[model samples]
Target: EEDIWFQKDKLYKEHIQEVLDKWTQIDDEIWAKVIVFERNRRVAKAYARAPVLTINGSDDGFDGMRIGLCGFDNPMRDQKTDEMKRVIGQGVKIKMDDAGNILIRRYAKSNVYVKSTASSPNEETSIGAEILKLPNQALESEKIVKLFDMKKFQSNVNRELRRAYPDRRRLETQCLSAVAFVKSENDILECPIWVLIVNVVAMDMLKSKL
Candidate 1:
């Protein structure tokens, strides 16, 4: 086992270095395109820069790899939707080195190419908001919660609660009719706690209307 490990380290190191260099070139090309577009945009929204692409570097540690071929990560396998990991199996082309170590690649102008945001409405905002039912403890229990920076927790389920409740929309509708839908727009923004009215405390009040 140790003998194979020794050979594998040297083998993967060479492959990693090659991937790093190739990704750099890919980064440069995409950056050039972003620059061209940003300069030509209207005088308004000058602050709008292209989203950061490929600022990530080689992972010397082995989170994204496997003994066999891998695929663009699905939520089931790995929740973090980092494209670098997905650039395997299919997004990344794979091959066997002369020594039998697996080599991976992303070809220039190929299927593993890139795109932008702001073009999609749903992408930026959550499909729906979720109530903070039980205050979740942070890694440090004392860490005061704030509206989290969404960048770090990139996966949907990681960031917010998912389709956690069935008939959730129906409940919302029930509450709206309870009050004759006369709540302020500010109340709409406060949907998580106010508009939602989940659980034992508020459900009684919310359900009483209908």
Candidate 2:
């Protein structure tokens, strides 16, 4: 399995690099993103502690800290067969090593959301719904309560809320509605609650992608 992953990894990196290089040469308006999905079966117990990124170094270029399922793929099946055909489309060649993992590549653009306040309409409602019901204890817990570097868990929460709600007026109104909730907050602590959630989701997504 390791050998297969290595082969797939090598091919994926090589081809992705090739595409990037070609785009660089032509100066085409191009960008790219890559994600590796793994399966629960092959993942080890240490995954709970270190996770694959710590071992494999696949997330070398990503930014942001909150982890979640971000890409598309499933890891539990024989990926070299029809799964690849269905997900990756026809005519895409894949190479695998003895262990059976296959390396596939594609070309695409990328979006980097770094503190921009703009969000889509559905994003605002989705985020608001998720936050409105957040358990009070969960909200009070040091993990969620604290503000760091001028950023609060609520900042992310609000960002997602606004994203889920998108309309500036609607977002403002919803926030105003929650003034008591935001102000009533007292305890503050620092921890990686969001990181844990992100890691868990990322691990699941990676496994499924495989």
Candidate 3:
């Protein structure tokens, strides 16, 4: 997984500058425009808290659940999960350890973090290797694309609907301003699809937040 991240990041850094260079508006003298392909949910959540978090992973795993050298945990997994449910619906289940098993992507309020280490050795030690580091913060986009098989989504809907709403007991998120995007396998134009955003009672709170 570390190798996987390094490779993706390497490619991203190698090419993202080209993309950023083309659209200088997105970047500046200190912060650069970047998009991350988070390998799974944990990674994405970490990235949400602090983009720098993605570049660092330990075998330590989740804190107390500690799985030996490979187990890892995010300090803000609770917060991350809740926020996501608000967007995708409580029915959408993304376990802290369930990253590779799912699929997703989209937009957000772009964030930039400082490089804890030099982007490359001998570079300006400070003045923001990435910019003086901050813990990290995370985005929003309008559409929710059904990029996977329908049965999988439907099963989740049933499972979650049963678990979250009353038909009423489980917290439910119905269509408010729902839409979708077709999946594209390669260099193609996928027709697109849709998923729930919210209903009359969404971010509607659950006795609480996410």
Candidate 4:
């Protein structure tokens, strides 16, 4: 049998289109988009209409845009809700470069945790290869983290896949990455971890397999 790595049938185009629409929700800027989730519910979304996007209690500042996640409904009118709001006072800053590199800066008093789903260099060509979960890290106040370089990673994957399957056509996939807020390391595992999905726009993938 042939070395059947990636199956085109498994790549759902509809879901991909849906995600694409969400990413391009604000406009045709094609930079990146963010979706916030709390307890499995979508709270807010941010678009890259400007240079610096801020996530805060209100949309008073920032050039690109600001994601105000403070007005969401809270089931319990308790101290935790108040605490969470305060912790998210100024929120974080998200910036995406033309190179498809995403940068997230922690502006809140507490730490912001980050994790990403991606394939390693070696596994880029294999369908059976496990999707690696990069280690979780903390973003302290005023600190920044380079989430990942989508353009670079996409090119690597496309090149490897082409080498692995010369005669067959290859399709590209979009990435789903996330960041969250927590008062302490242990809190990262619990509920109300105000989180957001950062969707990076990979243009080359839509154009050609090569």
Candidate 5:
């Protein structure tokens, strides 16, 4: 069973890497452009205090979780440059604060767990193994795409770290970094590549756990 799970996990990670690579090549320009716009629009003020979290895996094998800070408002808005009708036509969602600056969010993920379950007793059977349980399994993959509410997610990250690290300040300092990229042609070209690299790192990290 362990071998089977390991094989599946390996295949899944490979598949993810392949897709990420392809995306970087295909949409490199658009992605880079977005990054450029995001960087230019980034406000010095912080938006959310919490980090975003993501979970990946199948039923039998548990992948890992990742935590990261979310990016600010969609950079596409900057592309419109005072064109209200055009911006509206693009159907972008605008989220601003009292200061009128766009807010950014972060993300994080956990390591995948293989064969996580609990035994349950029912009237018909003496004992039964609960089926595979993945992180945030109840939330649809699409729905989970939402950015983390800064303050709340930061609290959650701290809470989890406390179990492993007694020094919260160290953890925060180490984990927190500016993900916002400078908006430029060159920077945009690198977005997809960077995304692919990140996915590869994540898979490698998961493999190490086994």
Candidate 6:
């Protein structure tokens, strides 16, 4: 079966419109914003103010997004499986560079996977065109893997679109980043116990005269 990691939530369209509206009011210097979603509900929203952002359990003091998958607010809290509990503490860390590139490292024991169009293309491996299986973080390791490269993906998209429609010019930011915690990699094809629908787009593009 084919894989489908990121799907539009019921509030996806409405939330996107709100994001676009907020973009108009913000300064161009702001790089990007991230919205964390637990199934159909939005748990938290924040801008890329820090160099790195972490997603951990509700009681975590990691100074990042604290998400309790089984919080009373969470609709799926009733589904309290061990897989869900695994994501409760020190789930993952997302890093951002000045150009809005995103890197993710998984710390959770549960399987963590990403479906992104913004990552650099790989020829040697095949996990599907836009699917990436994040490697588990080793203890005391210094290496970090890039989950998404904004410049590369943006250029790639533009070049292909330009070739298809030579007469048209396009200018817009993109948001196709997502993270899901699963018991197995194959679960991405269906529905995982926990999925974080993320949108990391440029604020500079909002004010550009195109």
TM-score winner among the candidates? 4
Better of 3 and 6 by TM-score: 6
> 199, model 4: CA deviation in Å?
3.1
**Model 3 stretches with alpha carbons more than 4 Å out:** 1-5, 24-34, 37-114, 126-210
Global local distance difference test of model 6 = 0.46
In TM-score terms, candidate 3 sits at 0.19
Give the residue spans of candidate 5 off by over 4 A.
1-91, 94-145, 166-189, 192-210
Q: In candidate 2, what are the lDDT values of residues 1-210, reduced to their tens digit?
A: 441233322433333343435443532221112222332111211112211121111222233221122222335444342232232211111122222122221111111000111122333321222233555422322121111111222243446444654433322211111011111122111110001011122112222321
lDDT per residue as tens, model 4, 1-210: 221113222222322455557553546664655655553344444556665677776534223477766755545335664566566767788777766666677787766666432322223321111112323466656856565556555666556565745322223333444566654333322335454343445533544443
Better of 1 and 6 by TM-score: 6
lDDT scores in order: 0.21, 0.23, 0.24, 0.50, 0.23, 0.46
Best by lDDT: 4
What is candidate 1's lDDT per residue for 18-87, written digit by digit as tens?
3334543443212111111111111110111122112112232112221111211122322222332333
Worst lDDT 10-window in candidate 3 = 45-54
Separate clash counts for every candidate: 0, 21, 26, 1, 38, 0
Ordering by TM-score: 4, 6, 5, 3, 2, 1
User: How many clashes does the backbone of model 4 have?
Assistant: 1
Q: Which is the winner by lDDT between candidate 2 and candidate 4?
A: 4
Indicate the residue-level lDDT of 50 in model 2.
19
lDDT computed for candidate 3 = 0.24
- Candidate 3 per-residue C-alpha lDDT over 1-210 given as tens digits, one digit per residue, 9 for 90 to 100: 331233322432433334325543432221112122222122221111111111112244223221121223334344433333223221111111121111122332222111112133322221211112223311123222222222332343445545543232222211111122212122111101112111111212222333
**Cα RMSD of predicted structure 4:** 8.8
Cα RMSD (Å) per model?
25.1, 21.0, 22.4, 8.8, 19.2, 6.8
Error of 4 at 21 (Å): 5.5
Cα-based TM-score, every candidate: 0.14, 0.17, 0.19, 0.63, 0.20, 0.62
